[PDB]
Design an enzyme around this catalytic site. Sequence first.
Site, PDB file in Angstrom:
ATOM      1  N   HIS A  68       0.854  -1.218   0.000  1.00 14.21           N
ATOM      2  CA  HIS A  68       0.000   0.000   0.000  1.00 14.21           C
ATOM      3  C   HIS A  68       0.873   1.246   0.000  1.00 14.21           C
ATOM      4  O   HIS A  68       0.800   2.054   0.916  1.00 14.21           O
ATOM      5  CB  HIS A  68      -0.968  -0.033   1.163  1.00 14.21           C
ATOM      6  CG  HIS A  68      -2.004  -1.092   1.025  1.00 14.21           C
ATOM      7  ND1 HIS A  68      -1.904  -2.297   1.664  1.00 14.21           N
ATOM      8  CD2 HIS A  68      -3.163  -1.119   0.336  1.00 14.21           C
ATOM      9  CE1 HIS A  68      -2.973  -3.022   1.389  1.00 14.21           C
ATOM     10  NE2 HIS A  68      -3.757  -2.327   0.569  1.00 14.21           N
ATOM     11  N   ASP A 217      -8.246  -0.534  -8.208  1.00 19.50           N
ATOM     12  CA  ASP A 217      -7.624  -0.953  -6.945  1.00 19.50           C
ATOM     13  C   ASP A 217      -7.198  -2.410  -7.015  1.00 19.50           C
ATOM     14  O   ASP A 217      -6.181  -2.720  -6.426  1.00 19.50           O
ATOM     15  CB  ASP A 217      -8.597  -0.771  -5.792  1.00 19.50           C
ATOM     16  CG  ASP A 217      -7.885  -0.654  -4.467  1.00 19.50           C
ATOM     17  OD1 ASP A 217      -6.690  -0.343  -4.474  1.00 19.50           O
ATOM     18  OD2 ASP A 217      -8.545  -0.819  -3.451  1.00 19.50           O
TER      19      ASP A 217
HETATM   20 MG   LIG Z   1      -7.234   0.967   0.641  1.00 17.22          MG
HETATM   21 ZN   LIG Z   2      -5.559   0.504  -2.807  1.00 15.42          ZN
END
Ligand SMILES: [Mg+2]
Ligand SMILES: [Zn+2]
Length: 313
Positions: A68, A217
Amino acid sequence: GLMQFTLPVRLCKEIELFHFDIGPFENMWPGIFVYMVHRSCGTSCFELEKLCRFIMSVKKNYRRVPYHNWKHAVTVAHCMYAILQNNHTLFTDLERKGLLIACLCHDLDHRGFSNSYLQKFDHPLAALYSTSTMEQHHFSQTVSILQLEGHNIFSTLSSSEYEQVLEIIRKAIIATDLALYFGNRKQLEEMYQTGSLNLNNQSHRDRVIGLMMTACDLCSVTKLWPVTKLTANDIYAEFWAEGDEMKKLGIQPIPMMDRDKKDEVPQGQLGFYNAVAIPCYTTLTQILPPTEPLLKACRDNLSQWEKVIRGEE
Ligand SMILES: [Mg+2]
Ligand SMILES: [Zn+2]
Ligand SMILES: CNC(=O)c1cnn(C)c1C(=O)Nc1ccn2cc(-c3ccccc3)nc2n1
Ligand SMILES: [Cl-]
């Protein structure tokens, strides 16, 4: 004004493809991102001095975590760029502005832990935000960086265009809470089947944009197998560190997060491709036909994991 960014020939061509990898050179990722804003939105939509300063403050507020991280932020922005460039006329001037920025900011100041670990740890953010904990933080962090002197890339929008775009970015970022994805896809599925789906219904756009956000994502599952396989290592590096931290709180973690059950990863990816990835890109292709390459690359990677299980790799 007349300062168009230019990529080397191979990047200039491959950046347009859904499965593009932004490469291991950190110091090109900002240019890549500005390249994508300029081609997606125009050379005008942001002042370069302000954009460049926003990008670098955003970079500084991503942490040195295995997955991340800043590379994830730019990878997810590139996927959104591919979706927007393949669906030219379906999206407004503001939506392109807001969604590329949303994708860049969607995981700001991520610590490498799930919403679940924050709640069980009893982190302050878990008292401040009962649901979508990290996502309300990521949005909060986005607004703080826009309010730094010289950082308001939206300065030249009317009051109302300005509230529209911060609303787009907020919904966009909240929607990356995967716990919200399951219900959002179910409703889009029902609305596409029954025929009620209507992109002029603002609340229907919201849902569509939310699924785009889930699809961008998750886009590590839509790359060429070597990229997908090597990203999986970084994803599990965080899952397993979180499992470690669960065991320190005296809680046996789910198998996904237990490095002892590392043996069972191939089967776990199958589960995740079947339960999340495939349904996500299927429903996305139905609503936005030109995103089909994401579905096809996801099916190929599903097939690559089937080959791992069967001892053939
Ligand atoms: Mg996230
Ligand atoms: Zn993400
Ligand atoms: C590639 N991207 C991802 O994996 C990805 C990206 N975002 N998110 C949320 C995911 C993700 O949830 N993946 C999952 C989901 C369920 N799993 C169960 C197992 C498992 C079970 C037993 C032994 C070993 C593993 N592994 C899993 N992995
Ligand atoms: Cl174009």
